[PDB]
Amino acid sequence: AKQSMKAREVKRVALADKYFAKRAELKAIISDVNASDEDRWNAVLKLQTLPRDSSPSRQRNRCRQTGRPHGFLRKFGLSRIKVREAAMRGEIPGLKKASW
Amino acid sequence: RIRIRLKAFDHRLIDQATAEIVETAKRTGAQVRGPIPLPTRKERFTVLISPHVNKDARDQYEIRTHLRLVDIVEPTEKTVDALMRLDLAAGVDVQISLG
Amino acid sequence: QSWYLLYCKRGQLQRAQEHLERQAVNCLAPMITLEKIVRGKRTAVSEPLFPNYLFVEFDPEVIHTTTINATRGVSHFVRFGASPAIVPSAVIHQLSVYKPKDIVDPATPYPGDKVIITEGAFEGFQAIFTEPDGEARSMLLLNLINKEIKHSVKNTEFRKL
Amino acid sequence: ERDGLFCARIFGPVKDYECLCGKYKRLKHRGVICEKCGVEVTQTKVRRERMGHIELASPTAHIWFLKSLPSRIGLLLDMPLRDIERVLYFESYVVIEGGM
Amino acid sequence: VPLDGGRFATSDLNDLYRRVINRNNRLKRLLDLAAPDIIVRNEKRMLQEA
DNA sequence: CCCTGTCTGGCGTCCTCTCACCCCTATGATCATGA
DNA sequence: TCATGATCATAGGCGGTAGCGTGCGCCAGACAGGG
Numbered sequence: 104a105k106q107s108m109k110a111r112e113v114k115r116v117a118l119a120d121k122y123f124a125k126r127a128e129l130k131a132i133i134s135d136v137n138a139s140d141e142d143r144w145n146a147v148l149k150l151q152t153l154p155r156d157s158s159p160s161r162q163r164n165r166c167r168q169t170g171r172p173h174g175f176l177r178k179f180g181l182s183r184i185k186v187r188e189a190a191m192r193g194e195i196p197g198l199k200k201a202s203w
Numbered sequence: 204r205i206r207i208r209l210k211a212f213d214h215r216l217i218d219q220a221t222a223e224i225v226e227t228a229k230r231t232g233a234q235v236r237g238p239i240p241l242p243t244r245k246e247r248f249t250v251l252i253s254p255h256v257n258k259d260a261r262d263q264y265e266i267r268t269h270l271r272l273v274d275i276v277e278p279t280e281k282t283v284d285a286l287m288r289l290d291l292a293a294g295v296d297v298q299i300s301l302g
Numbered sequence: 303q304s305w306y307l308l309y310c311k312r313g314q315l316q317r318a319q320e321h322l323e324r325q326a327v328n329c330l331a332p333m334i335t336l337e338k339i340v341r342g343k344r345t346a347v348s349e350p351l352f353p354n355y356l357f358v359e360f361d362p363e364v365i366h367t368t369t370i371n372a373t374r375g376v377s378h379f380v381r382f383g384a385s386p387a388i389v390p391s392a393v394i395h396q397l398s399v400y401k402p403k404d405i406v407d408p409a410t411p412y413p414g415d416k417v418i419i420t421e422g423a424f425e426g427f428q429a430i431f432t433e434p435d436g437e438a439r440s441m442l443l444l445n446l447i448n449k450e451i452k453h454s455v456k457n458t459e460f461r462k463l
Numbered sequence: 464e465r466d467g468l469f470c471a472r473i474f475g476p477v478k479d480y481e482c483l484c485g486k487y488k489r490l491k492h493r494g495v496i497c498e499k500c501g502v503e504v505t506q507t508k509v510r511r512e513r514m515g516h517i518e519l520a521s522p523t524a525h526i527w528f529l530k531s532l533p534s535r536i537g538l539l540l541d542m543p544l545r546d547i548e549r550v551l552y553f554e555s556y557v558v559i560e561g562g563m
Numbered sequence: 564v565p566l567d568g569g570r571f572a573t574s575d576l577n578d579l580y581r582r583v584i585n586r587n588n589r590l591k592r593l594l595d596l597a598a599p600d601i602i603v604r605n606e607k608r609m610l611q612e613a
Numbered sequence: 614c615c616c617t618g619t620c621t622g623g624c625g626t627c628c629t630c631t632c633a634c635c636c637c638t639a640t641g642a643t644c645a646t647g648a
Numbered sequence: 649t650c651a652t653g654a655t656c657a658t659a660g661g662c663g664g665t666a667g668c669g670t671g672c673g674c675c676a677g678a679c680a681g682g683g
Contacts, residue, residue: 125274178246181289186250195210200262201245246394297447299448300448302449357598372665373664381553381605383555389601390601403597426484519610544679566634617680617681618680621679625674636660641657643661648649
């Protein structure tokens, strides 16, 4: 992937980090059935106000080395290609070719 | 009683670690329960090995996390205290828990 | 015949102050309580804060000092100079009642203190009194690769075994 | 006693490669420091060369520059030695920042 | 040095450093719990002389 | 400021051998015996 | 069972309601007294 995409993501991550408490509180308010209607409306409007990159559902998991969006794995934080390279080169602990 | 949960990828290494902790226990205290083997976690992964496109071309790796449950029935003064200075070989995550 | 701060000795006021408070003599020192687990026992003693600093009222010339020397209360005058300096009595005059600093009981622990928790074999590591609950016993504040348990230790022990 | 005049975590181990707590004594295990007593398992020759410091609670005049005849603090300040001795032993007052 | 009698006739330097550290710790404690006005002076004189 | 007395700092051989000496006193705590 | 007495072990810097010091000597340079 490009440098720019990586930068965008980093930004998005930063924003998620920043606004977590507020966004979560707002979600809770909106959910809370034992609450005033006007308050709920205020909450949903307030959610709208916050930045979009603040959402965690915006950020895409990439390879931590290449930034490749597809073929990702969570345990390793790497795309399939780089993961395989890692297995071969010995740098992933415990990982070896499996047969059964 | 002190339950101890040894976890590692290498099984020979974990075995060595189990032994060593058992010795540490036995000299100081008395009635070590024993090195019980729990089930191993075989976390498998499939991946495409082609850079671009060959879907049937694949490699299937796995990680074998091995578990060893060692238990100490009588915690004495000396015994529990030994363990603090007696660190184990690396790549072996231990997990002690009294009671 | 007045208030004067002298570096003195300790603990036996009432005799040199028998010489003194035989008169209307005046005496004072800063104050502090001490909770100190002396030997397995919390002891509470509101003793003077300072070492030998002490306010005594007496009169210099007719009663010469070497006669009175044979007693405590005698290290020497507050001087800042050769002559025995006329001291102020700031506490007596404008600072009567104090010690709201704390009752810290200088360096002896309160609940939650961070110091030695075990000796003998397991010690070589400042494990922690997450609470000196009661000086009796528990299982240490130890921390390896599991849960952080608190003290492993009997009465005289959790602190300096 | 830690950490008095003779120490171990200030000045080093008493015995060579002999950690106070004792945990490192291998030929293929040199360089790593201790964790219990925190004594770097090295040599006892290093107790001949490590120095410690005392933080004085109030500053303190060195005697070699005060009373060596001539006094370097004396004929640096343009001030005779008797005034400097009567100031340094807390039985007078000298003026700093005299003002208008 | 040991004198092979259960006791250590110490060298003079450890005595001197021990006196400085005694007097300095007592001066830290006296500056801690507040000095009685014209009082935080005798202890500094003692430290300077040690 | 120009002497002239006082003061307090420096210094006072080398090499070797032998021997003694290097806290005791006071206070507090614990144990045992007697009432 | 309780209280008292005796014995043993452990713990710090003139000792005293002052005074101890007193039998080297030269040189030298600064600090100060007298004029």
